[PDB]
Design a protein around this ligand. Sequence first.
Ligand SMILES: *[C@H]1OC[C@@H](O[C@@H]2OC[C@@H](O)[C@H](O)[C@H]2O)[C@H](O)[C@H]1O
Ligand SMILES: *[C@H]1OC[C@@H](O[C@@H]2OC[C@@H](O)[C@H](O)[C@H]2O)[C@H](O)[C@H]1O
Lengths: 427, 427
Amino acid sequence: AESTLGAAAAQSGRYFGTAIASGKLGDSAYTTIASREFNMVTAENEMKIDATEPQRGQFNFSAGDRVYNWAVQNGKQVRGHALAWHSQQPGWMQSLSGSTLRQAMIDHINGVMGHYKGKIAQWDVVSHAFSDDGSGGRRDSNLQRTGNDWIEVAFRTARAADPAAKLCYNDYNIENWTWAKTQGVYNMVRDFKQRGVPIDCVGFQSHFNSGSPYNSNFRTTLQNFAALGVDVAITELDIQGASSSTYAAVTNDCLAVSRCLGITVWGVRDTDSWRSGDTPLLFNGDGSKKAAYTAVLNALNGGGQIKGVGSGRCLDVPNASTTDGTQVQLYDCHSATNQQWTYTDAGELRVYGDKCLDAAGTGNGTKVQIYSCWGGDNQKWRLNSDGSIVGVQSGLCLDAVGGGTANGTLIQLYSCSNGSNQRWTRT
Amino acid sequence: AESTLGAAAAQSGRYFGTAIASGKLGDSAYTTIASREFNMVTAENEMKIDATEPQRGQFNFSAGDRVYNWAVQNGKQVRGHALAWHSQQPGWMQSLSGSTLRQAMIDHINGVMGHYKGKIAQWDVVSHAFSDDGSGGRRDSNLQRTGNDWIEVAFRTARAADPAAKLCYNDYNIENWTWAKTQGVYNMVRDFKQRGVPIDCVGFQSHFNSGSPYNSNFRTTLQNFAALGVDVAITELDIQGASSSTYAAVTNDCLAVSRCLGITVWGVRDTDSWRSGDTPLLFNGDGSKKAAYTAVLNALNGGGQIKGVGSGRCLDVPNASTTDGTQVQLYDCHSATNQQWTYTDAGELRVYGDKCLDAAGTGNGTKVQIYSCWGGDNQKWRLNSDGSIVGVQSGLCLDAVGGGTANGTLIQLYSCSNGSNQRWTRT
Ligand SMILES: *[C@H]1OC[C@@H](O[C@@H]2OC[C@@H](O)[C@H](O)[C@H]2O)[C@H](O)[C@H]1O
Ligand SMILES: *[C@H]1OC[C@@H](O[C@@H]2OC[C@@H](O)[C@H](O)[C@H]2O)[C@H](O)[C@H]1O
């Protein structure tokens, strides 16, 4: 299969997952998308320390089990997150220190993994243990204060608790190979593999934004870790603005690494994101597939003028007008700026540099025209492999009215039918 | 004098107003912006029929006076809206028809205008009375069903109630001259003037979006009505996406017509808008001035490479790199693509076509770099006449670190100081 992300990833033995929030499982729109598109699930918060052990020695898996059960019942594997780290610790653990904390860490690992023994594909045993100060050293936390060997102990503890799960070390800002933090983690994992410390995978948060941009060397980082004899996984992927090229680039980086088990995006819809202001996911708040969704799907499946297949004519702006509201048409192809369209990272089809292919509404018969670019979803489009061009907001296809093929035939939105008047070739 | 919208508009004897919502007056950010920028106020809902006459014969001005008092206390004039129309009628009026409704309409006009007698600059006596069906005729409402002369009667009643107020007929979709609706309204106003019916102005909602685009013939529309002997006013202006060129065009249309009294935008911040999803106003949710704000201010005030004054060097992307996160610098100006910036309608400074001048943060010293364009406010800039370039999200100026002038000098964000290292020209 290749119409959904998970199924597309499965073609190469990989998975495409998401972070599930138990509180959203009652949202039909949410579950419809999540059950259909992903085959791997990570509990967004339900399996963390405070959620699973609210009081010292008192475990609770009500929320964790609901996420786990929803996942397995809907055909998805699960990544456990997270067993031992400085963040979101319950009040009682935050106050602990020394051997007492070290013992509480061990007890927590045994309790949680024991509850889910043999049912978890991957466990983020330790996460966010390194600093961002630029030294490439450990983060100063109550756990780190118990001794530099706490991470190694956590992993040894984890292996014994559940030998069937892949044990991962997860962190962020370790994607760019030139960063000190990336090197610090690399050296630790290398040391671990050399000394025989039980670690099977390294998780890369992959939280990209202009403050910590994606860089092509992320593939090199993944390959360098894979060379150490550990699998790698993109664990919390989200990209500020959801650039189509960047999402495709990250997807292809995993596909280029044999040991990359799969990719998980941190959330379903932008409105479900912990960073919603950055609209960093693959689905909009209304549940519509974004331009980035198609870019990712295309990559997973192994994937100028815009000419209509049925007419042989090009998408044209009448008389090279730059007036907002000018409906586009079909016209004999020729070298002119009013027939030169540029597909942007945001999913727009631009002309003249700052004018956007624009849908004047959302239903069948909607006029498609040029309008000043401003970021509306009615100005975003998905370029499908079959040649159809679908409006993000409407979910409708660019359509040459009535199947017309002569010069002057107007363009509208219309239910996709795979008709020749809805298929386009880019040159 | 020329630093705020109202003051700039006053330089041509006009006003620049907004719609005020009484329920938002407790918001310090809201009132700070509103009090500072506008010299005309329209109550968004507080002076409508249901808000001023909750029961037949029982008037209530608690809501209206809160808006009125705030306006006068802050030096603004007031546009009354709206006395007789089909929308937002209280239940008791919705139940009326024929002569009973006709008298209730007259009583309402007398009651409300009497309360505000002599304190209102303009009153939208009747609003939204024409149909959008293309016939150019009247909208079917209980008022229209009382007789075609209801509008005339409303105006005659209003003149007698308060001879000091300018009486306006307000409507939408009457901006494009070619529309039947526009001409139907024109015919009515012409008839009124010819027969001596008291009408002093025509208000144009000016609600523009790709579904009902702004058209340059709007200036001829304004001119046509002005020639009838009535003033004109842009009453509820908002533009989808807040296109800078469109906002400037509309502003210039009013500035070109001597009888255009002024412009009112329908709201303060995008988040306050009745159509917030179209981010159609001049201020963002966090209260920052958008690129469109500067476009309007510039227009009211009379109306490639980016060289730094003093250094004489141009904004340059190091080694013509296209890598996200590359900090920009100053460098000898030369015909190169890694220079050549394009200011878009959305307020971006683009390079390479799809890369955006990007601020990785909001404080002083913030790195200014290139990043994929996605619409973030940290990618929007305002080009001031003094030569400064201010980041919309940060409110800080593009700054050449340490006042450096040699090649390699990095660009950052920094509190505006009018220094030569924060002044740019184009070129
Ligand atoms: C990676 O970063 C995202 C983390 O998830 C968030 O943690 C804080 C919660 O408030 C938020 O809802 C979560 O999405 C995740 O645990 C890290 O590993
Ligand atoms: C012009 O259009 C906007 C109208 O104002 C809105 O009316 C409906 C309310 O729910 C909304 O809050 C208002 O902004 C105005 O009255 C018309 O003249």
